[PDB]
Symmetry: D2
Subunit: 323 residues, 4 copies
């Protein structure tokens, strides 16, 4: 058993011990553990997935170096890896399609078991590790959540975007997720027009820096999108905020058949106008995290120079805890 | 110009004149004009699509006999036909995919121009007419809306149903639409379990008569569906009511990745729990009417004996105005 | 190490030893090992997948009883199970979507490692075992290949079938696979018309017994299908034979946009008329085996009485070796 | 009736008369009529679609200026337009989904009725005309076939390409179609690797000029693609040639689940290895022309500067007849 310095969540406002790996398990030395809006919802005790219990080391957005292995892990000590965060039960019909992210008995380091705000972290199986060929664990850490979630959301969006020669895609909420959502869209789709929506001028400026073509307050978005699309509307809106008001307003900006990809869940509920949605065949599609292939893909885009990290190192854009 | 007895909507609480057909236009003698919840929303002035104006003959659910033709109509006088209700502008990118039903400049007899609560009715083009080979116009009339809408909704549902060997499909709201939605599902899908939800015991009994396997109040639906699916949840919920509360409650009954098909729009808004929807990749898909192929298909199912009409004839289930 | 009586393939025209399970491995007592056309191609040395080597116990279509377990198997001794046959490497992008069946480094009992024509058989992981709640291992054995392959093929077909109200589906080649393909189609799709094609009158009779609506020689199929579909053509052809001539002829029977699902590979090549295929947007879609969910699904259909086995017990339709 | 100078096909090795438009018909002054490999197959009497008869003015790839209109045409004299080439019967289930291109009773100017190698040309309906806002009819003419066909083929490919972060796409045959296929792919997809295959060094050089990343002889393609994809294979192969040998060889280069999009039909048949296709779930998808939206889209890409024409003007890359 290995000693490790961590940050513990004990009540909703130092040095721990970590078991040695057996079977397929792997022990890693954390290089980076990203800080999510999800950590703050757990921190504030407004979100608790199955198996959650106190205390717990938070941090579900993790990269580092392999230091010890069980006899069945089949991985190389010294390799840098990013940790896929949603460890499915492997048995259910979702896991049997690689949809570990929507397994209802998933184990999540930092959300339901000990995570990355710690020197060392146990990983249940090497099957959850994606190799970093050249990207640093610190820069790679956000890919384990913000990156993968952005990719999974974009993949749901693609058929809606590909229907048009010059589609407008709305990205609502410019924070950690928008870093990856905007850059991934521009990396893949050469003829897309991205519109960034936020209430903060600072955030709108940042969306432009990330690669948004236009930015807007929500109230001004219709007049802009009308002009950009000759009244057609947006192909997709990726909602990184997810409140009653964001989805309602986004839905109305969509062209017929268009979709909101719901990633954010800051509100208790989401809402849509019944007439606009039913009459024009509009859609809302929930998106939680992504597949192992999605994580592989964002690592590859990053290592090939197509995505740039915007990270803020924080000693124990996106913030990253190092160690 | 032809004289005709109709029922006029003049304020929101006899004998008219009808132009002779030119070009591709066709004049029909109405055999049946169905009565919709949509007529009551227009009647009460809570719904007005583009081009709507007073006065107007309502009735958008129409069948009858061809009596006169323009020189370009290319149809046979004496043929019985059902009238496709959503006459697209033919020019837009939705009409160019046969998606006339979601054209934003559609002309609709009974909703935006004169309809079927009348002895005779002008049809803008023969392209909107589907032949009845043996079904009577009176029995066929509901296919022009309830039938086609049910088919379009089911077609959106199919890939979600086909994922499972023994899927539960929820049908919420047991009225005119449920007549066709339940029967069409059972006509196509041999191994489906249909659960009918309504607050009325009478309506629940009627759902069983139509072919539902089980019926339930919404509050009891979770415990039933849990038992029927070993906790998996429903594959699809077809919402024929469409209020803030119906969608919210239906969403929770779905298995991961499952969808609500939103057909009804009795409420101003619909709503969903943000966590349940985002975390489990659930969906809401708007459905308005269907394609000409959908209308052809429900006519064929009806003529082959696979759907039975539940109609109530009303001299000027589903009510039908005759003439 | 456990003694076991098997049948060995030593050259291309008794009693062996079997290792005890470790880690996730499971040892089963074979109840049924089905005999495939694939075994005969391996037997004749005309087919050898990666890792194949002599000698080898054939038989990739297996069910039986759990008798011993490794410490990590997490399964119950005494349970009856069917063995999923395509053991993926778990690492590749296909396995990460549960597509173990198309993993290029798959291990297959009876095709690349020791299989089921043997009293006992080692299974690499309990993850490859699907529980039989009530079906006997002998009756269940064909589900491990013929059944699952039929299901996977049908699942590719579904969107092509669901486009129509009264689709004709062709099933070409009436042998072991047709047992499941025909019955599964009829179990799922209530309004389908199945046309069975074979050169053998005996086989055509058997297709009718299995649930085909019509049967035909290939040369007579066009005139029949024309009559059944008013010249539209077939929605799908499932080719269980797969020669140069079968695909060529089947392609021509399809409606525009229709597909051949290629399951059989009795020929070296398949072929299609370039004009008919390109001009009418026809398709050919390869299908190898299925997912773990596909196996689960055919087990459930069988246990619910919706599929009937046609098995021939053979002491060491479909033949089954017992033990 | 209007006099016009044309080129007539009379046997398989000057001045005509053209009727005045009625109803929805439009008369155009040809600005450009492109020359296709299809014209040469008709010219040589190796291809004749329904309704074809001698004599006939060839040329199905047409743009020009509106000069006269029937009373129902609803278009503006003086407007420049490109002519959609596949005039569906409007009645069938394919036309009811805007799939005019696969209507079996289509009328095609230059293939089944008089076409564009002529000063003036009658267009059956204004519904077949797409407006040119700024592109010249001469430069626009190839969009009416090569352009639209490329777009339709790419649209079938997209879901296969979008599955990967860095997909290789093969384009086989570098002629008129490749001009648009290569440029459209690069216009839409920023992270694609295009491999051009041809037997001609000249054509391979031209593929590089058009935007291919690599070029190869077919025999050398496997070793290249293996290196480019770490042995995965190509996501898609667009076959602009379409012979027994091209499809066979292309199929083998594909990753599991990958597809050939069959556009070319230079051979009588196409062929595929049965084992490679069935075992790895590979596909062949026929593609004929595209939708009206596809034509709109390539016009827009061209007018926005994202596609460049490679045209050769020929007084009566791609050749264009002017007038
Ligand atoms: Zn997070
Ligand atoms: Zn699971
Ligand atoms: Zn209605
Ligand atoms: Zn329209
Ligand atoms: Zn087999
Ligand atoms: Zn694999
Ligand atoms: Zn051409
Ligand atoms: Zn047609």
């Amino acid at each position: 058993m290995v000693k490790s310095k961590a940050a513990l969540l004990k009540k909703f406002s130092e040095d721990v011990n970590i078991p040695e790996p057996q079977g397929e398990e792997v022990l890693i030395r954390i290089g980076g553990a990203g800080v999510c809006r999800t950590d703050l919802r757990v921190w504030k005790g407004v979100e608790a997935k199955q198996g959650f219990r106190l205390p717990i080391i938070l941090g579900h957005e993790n990269a580092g170096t392999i230091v010890e292995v069980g006899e069945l892990a089949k991985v190389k000590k010294g390799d840098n890896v990013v940790v896929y965060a949603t460890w499915g039960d492997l048995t259910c019909r979702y896991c049997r399609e690689g949809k570990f992210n929507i397994c209802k008995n998933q184990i999540i380091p930092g959300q339901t078991t000990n995570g990355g705000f710690s020197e060392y972290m146990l990983v249940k199986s090497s099957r959850w590790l994606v190799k970093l060929n050249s990207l640093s664990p610190v820069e790679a850490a956000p890919l384990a959540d913000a990156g993968t979630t952005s990719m999974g959301a974009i993949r749901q969006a693609l058929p809606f975007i590909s229907k048009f020669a010059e589609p407008v895609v709305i990205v609502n909420g410019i924070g950690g997720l928008a870093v990856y959502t905007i850059q991934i869209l521009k990396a893949l789709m050469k003829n897309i027009t991205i519109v960034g929506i936020s209430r903060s001028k600072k955030h709108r400026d940042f969306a432009l820096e990330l690669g948004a073509d236009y930015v807007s307050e929500m109230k001004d978005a219709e007049s802009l999108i009308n002009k950009l699309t000759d009244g057609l509307g947006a192909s997709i809106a990726i909602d990184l905020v997810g409140t009653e008001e964001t989805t309602y307003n986004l839905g109305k900006l969509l062209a017929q058949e268009g979709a909101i990809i719901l990633v954010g869940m800051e509100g208790k509920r989401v809402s849509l106008e019944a007439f606009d949605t039913a009459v024009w065949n509009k859609k809302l599609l929930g998106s939680n995290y992504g597949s192992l292939n999605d994580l592989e893909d964002v690592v590859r885009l990053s290592e090939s120079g197509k995505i740039k990290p915007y990270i803020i190192k924080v000693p124990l854009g996106r913030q990253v805890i190092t160690p």
